[PDB]
């Protein structure tokens, strides 16, 4: 796997940083801080070593560092790193990734 700011997740756990939630719309109308919601869009910043589905073989993590992914509404766990937020997820919990 790959470690991000001295943190290597184990197994198939993936560490993501949630993107900045919107605070203004296209026409200039700006939003309150409470009603921004929880953003489901993030970028994969760290990948685990991969879960051992069967003995004698290792299954790598499908996503890689630098891929824009769509997080589910539920299932993440809190990670604090130098007073910054990050979220740990399972590999199968990520709904999909953005290619460009």
């Amino acid at each position: 796997g790959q470690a991000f700011r001295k943190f290597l997740p184990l197994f198939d756990r993936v560490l993501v940083e949630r993107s900045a939630a919107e605070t203004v719309t296209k026409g200039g109308i700006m939003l309150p801080e409470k009603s921004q919601g929880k953003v489901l869009q993030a970028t994969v910043v760290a990948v685990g070593s991969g879960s051992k589905g069967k003995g004698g073989e290792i299954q790598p993590v499908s996503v890689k560092v630098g891929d824009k992914v769509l997080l589910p509404e539920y299932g993440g766990t809190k990670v604090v790193l130098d007073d910054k937020d990050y979220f740990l997820f399972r590999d199968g919990d990520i709904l999909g990734k953005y290619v460009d």
Binding site: T25, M30, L31, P32, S35
Partner: protein, 137 residues
């Protein structure tokens, strides 16, 4: 057929008081002969006539942060957009496009609703105070 006869009738029926007849004839001339006139208690010595034109209703603003004129502690706009709703406006998406169409045309917005709850109130007052767009509820 003449307002003088109306003044005479209102003077005679009010125990010979000429001022009551004059003010009733003035009200008849102002709001029409078949008009809505209501008698109210006064806090001064002499009776007075107040003519209320347009639409007036006994409802105020939702939040006291919508005040822009400090002379009478009222809120005044000229050539303003008005939005109306029979139901209570609650969600963010139900109030944003009205703000977009008020900001794009650069016109004031007054929203007549039942009640505006916390999230839409926060959106309205934050857009009023931060960027300076004009809106009342």
């Amino acid at each position: 057929t003449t307002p003088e006869e109306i003044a005479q009738v209102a003077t005679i029926s009010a125990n010979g008081d000429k001022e009551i007849g004059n003010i009733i004839s003035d009200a008849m001339k102002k709001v029409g002969r078949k008009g809505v006139i209501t008698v109210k208690d006064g806090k001064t010595l002499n009776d007075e006539l107040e003519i209320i034109e347009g639409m007036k209703f006994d409802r105020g603003y939702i939040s006291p942060y919508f005040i822009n004129t400090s002379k009478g502690q009222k809120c005044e706009f000229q050539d303003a957009y008005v939005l109306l709703s029979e139901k209570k406006i609650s969600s963010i998406q139900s109030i944003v496009p009205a703000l977009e169409i008020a900001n794009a045309h650069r016109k004031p917005l007054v929203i007549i609703a039942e009640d505006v709850d916390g999230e839409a109130l926060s959106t309205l007052v934050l857009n009023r105070l931060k960027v300076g767009l004009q809106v009342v509820a």
